[PDB]
Subunit: 452 residues, 3 copies
């Protein structure tokens, strides 16, 4: 389903067999945990069971005061990408929860059922859920024991039952403290698989997005956030910021670039060219979304998950950069220099190899050994036969993803540019920029020749 | 308390309502944990309690030898920032602890009280503390049981008591192994809240810094380090590198830049300008501290915490860059190019929006929907009315921090520069650099015209 | 054993007392854990022990289904470095394990002994091991209890024995879920010290590499990967990708660069020069390996561990850049600008200090206070006397590593270049590039003077 074409003219390759899943929104859900006020009780004794229960209660109290310590702390966590607050919706919902009666309203609403829809003070309604019931255990089967009337423990079963109806509050508090209240990815302790699926079921997305997020809950967790919101009264509420995917089943292709120099035998004076448009290109609505940072975009089988916050808006004519560089519809972006370095780029369905100078290049195999030797120039081999490629000192491994590969032979575009008037200081210039500079220099030389 | 002013001339905004807290030093404290030499004992049996105790002792021995495994391992963890060793003081204190009799001296000093001041071998005195007492349990209430004379366990209370007077050694050892001996931020297991506050109380800082670090212990942990130092004899010592704040209650302002191009209708030939001085500007003593990396600086309410290691020293005249770009006192830094891209910058008290070409721009609201439409040019709206802003394909969320915003209307400085002789290759140039280049080109053309 | 020489001509320093350990391959080993199919059993009761056992079994089932959730998820995790898949070998071994009968073959092979060599379906034989035996406990001492015939628990010893013959499956599953199936560094829970040493013993490396990796198992863990491979039948297999070091005991030196400007008293017109070749330089076979990213290379005492994937191949003549910049054998790389900034670089055996303009510079000591004051110009002091250095607003700490330092006095190379025709826009140019630009400008001026 994944097809790859390599263009020898620009030493770039694309993979147009991918399906898109772009995050175009945020969904906030409040998760509450009921707590108990046992700090007043101070049951103590020389008995081993009493000491163990006291230590467990001390750990619980430490966790509670350490969560309360985060209450007075605001939560917060290529060059043209810009900046943005990814957790802004979560902190807004937290601030809306910070008002006086919202805790009382959430308790009154959740006092009947586990999951309910609550209208907040700002007019925005968010789904609310209760995951843990610690009060129902402490105040009913532990509070009489901790009370000073008895201050005695019958058996170790009680302390183990407490540890197990706990340990989860402990891990949640530890994660909140380590991640300063903003934790990503959301762990299973913070939101288990069943509760996550239930929350996805009641989200107002459509059936296709529901199925997609149910089949990629790991990516959902990786693209989610959990922010500490309130610790007041006898409840603990933290907001989960689930992603919203509004772009479903649309074409996307990843573009890989490798530097292409000239084949001059001299050590110097070897001009070079490289394309500065690496990343994913997703189409959503009459335009192409550019994702320069490949780390923010995750690939699951044939489906790619990308974040629109770290994205750039480009016109639909950017696709012509792959077929015709000198097309007038769009201005392709290139980088110019003459550092004759040797390097190779590993692709999903192959490996672009371009070693220059006195650097060897071997495409080895796990059984037949070396099967291909590269000369001076851009080259590309599909992963059907070659398992790993070696460039000089390095030993790169080629991904063994199944698919089809295509080779588009063409004359390199660096052979059409005169090295005498070739600028080698461009960092983020374009084809039009380089053409204008070359024309300026050539016309300068022409007018000098005419004046002489 | 936070005020923001936006300048239309340079498409930059500042927020001068912040208070500074700069780290200008390091404080090292040694924390010791007593251990026991049970490796000689090999009590075993078919009883379930004996097997459980043996497994717990095996886990303890594994933790001990895994900490001893780190003994023979040295600990170690915009372009003009430079390099530096953040844990150099900690490794120096560790090396000073590595001498022969320092372990014996620390044991003799801490044998009486929990916290004491110890003069080291290098003449530097550091506060020392003992957080765990595992020897007092193992050698007094467990050693007779583990001894081969009995090799029998009366009840499961003993194994649970051991697990709980432990599990903390376990987590500490796991964190040390995961983080290669240098862990940051310091977890509550490594230094609890009470011990951290006690250590802050005896630090020789003044009352203001004491109160500030007591109210921001989360930031203190985030800016602290814990380095494994020694595992010898029957003690385990690791050094905690707490930050020292020598700059308290001084003005600081964060500056945000957005690219500003021309409003030409052509697809190309659209010159642009951007300021390359993003980051925080803190004044400490007759100078401004520049922090290009915003990740290293953390904001807590109206107080900002910054690290002087990743800082640059700038004269006090750098403030004039906000009011008068062409002031002769200081040379403002700008970036020149003509890639007409569309992007927006989210600010603390608003959002700077600058979309260019055929890219739409809407400032939506959670209740009234779209409330503002942006034309071609730099613009800025305060977060009082707009909740989220959308640029083309993206959907950015505006922070809802309370404050005041100001708009300073002015003619853009790109309208005063001729695009014909405008350089578009500058990456880290300045106003003087661009003026010199433009003057050179203009004088070149002038002298050609005079020669013809 | 570590010697450092500082060159005043280029304001760069080297440390040639290091020994190399380069990773030139990957070793994959399959680790299997036996599981049991208890999901059919649904023993329940009002007894406290029954409830505790049911909760433990529910936690085990949640861990199992959460590991099964990762089954349908492919695992995946200066400008001339290129890209590459570090876990490609691991995912290839996982795909080879994905075939039909490979699980049955691995079970049949491991049914007799703990560690055995297994020929895979692709013809590549990998060492296989079994670390946990959970089936031998559950199906023999727990299954009769969980069976509906009794559904009763005699004592809490059973549940504690289960928790302890577990908790490790729990931590492994939690780490796999947090790290999306690809975890690095490999924790001790995933591969303990004894099993790691045993695996190193049977690896086909030579004795020298065996000893080196046995003495640096922390670095081995830091440079290793653990990838979820299969969860089928009643076994759980995850592949460990250990590093292979094929370059042993070869010279390596780290090069540090600091900007060096002119000593002009004017605020502007102060040209500067900086070398853009920071990083480690390791020799392996007739060539020098360049590692621009210092984060990927770790230093252990006098031995440096580097990754060849993030490396560049350079000729052996690159060593001449340290002694003779203008040597014709190799073209040294420099950066040109005139931003007169003040900064210092902390070195292993000293600190290169270069502050320019009105910025103070003090080299303080822990006992004698300030011992040295720097004038305008590049300077370097060995860590023998100075403990910490201060540049303007900053307070940098100097590493106290023992060694020898050398000072090579020389005239700065910026004094040989005319500032009038000095280009100040070069980002990654070379000495030849700057010389060509200067010669072009000078010849242009010459021919103008001759024409006038």
């Amino acid at each position: 389903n994944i097809t790859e074409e390599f263009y020898q003219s620009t030493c770039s390759a694309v993979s147009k067999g991918y399906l898109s899943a772009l995050r175009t929104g945020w969904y906030t859900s409040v998760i509450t945990i009921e707590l108990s006020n046992i700090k007043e009780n101070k049951c103590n004794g020389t008995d081993a069971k009493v000491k163990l229960i006291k230590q467990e209660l001390d750990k619980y109290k430490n966790a509670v005061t350490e969560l309360q310590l985060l209450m007075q702390s605001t939560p917060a966590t290529g060059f043209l990408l810009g900046v943005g607050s990814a957790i802004a919706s979560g902190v807004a919902v937290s601030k809306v929860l910070h008002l006086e009666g919202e805790v009382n309203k959430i308790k009154s609403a959740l006092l009947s059922t586990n999951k309910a829809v609550v209208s907040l003070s700002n007019g925005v309604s968010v789904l609310t859920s209760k995951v843990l019931d610690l009060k129902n255990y402490i105040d009913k089967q532990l509070l009489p024991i901790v009370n000073k009337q008895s201050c005695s423990i019958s058996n170790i079963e009680t302390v183990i039952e407490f540890q197990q109806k706990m340990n989860r509050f402990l891990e949640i508090t530890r994660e909140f403290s380590v991640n300063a209240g903003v934790t990503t990815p959301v762990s299973t302790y913070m939101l288990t698989n069943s509760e996550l699926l239930s929350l996805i079921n009641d989200m107002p997305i459509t059936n296709d997005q529901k199925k997609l997020m149910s089949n990629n809950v790991q990516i959902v967790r990786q693209q989610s956030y959990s922010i500490m919101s309130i610790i007041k009264e006898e409840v603990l509420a933290y907001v989960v910021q689930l992603p919203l995917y509004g772009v479903i089943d649309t074409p996307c292709w990843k573009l890989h670039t490798s530097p292409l120099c000239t084949t001059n035998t001299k050590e110097g004076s070897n001009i070079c060219l490289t394309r500065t448009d690496r990343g994913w290109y997703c189409d959503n609505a009459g335009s192409v979304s550019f994702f320069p940072q490949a780390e923010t975009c995750k690939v699951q089988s044939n489906r790619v998950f990308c974040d629109t916050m770290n994205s750039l808006t480009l016109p639909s004519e950017v696709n012509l950069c792959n077929v015709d560089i000198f097309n007038p519809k769009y201005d392709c972006k290139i980088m110019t220099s003459k550092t004759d370095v040797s390097s190779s780029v590993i692709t999903s369905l192959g490996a672009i190899v371009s070693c220059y100078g006195k650097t060897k290049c071997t495409a080895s195999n796990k059984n037949r050994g070396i099967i291909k030797t590269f000369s001076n120039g851009c080259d590309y081999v599909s992963n059907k036969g070659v398992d790993t490629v070696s460039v000089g000192n390095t030993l790169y491994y080629v991904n063994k993803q199944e698919g089809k590969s295509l080779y588009v032979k063409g004359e390199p575009i660096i052979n059409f540019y005169d090295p005498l008037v070739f600028p080698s200081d461009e960092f983020d210039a374009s084809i039009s920029q380089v053409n204008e500079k070359i024309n300026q220099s050539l016309a300068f030389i022409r007018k000098f020749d005419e004046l002489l």
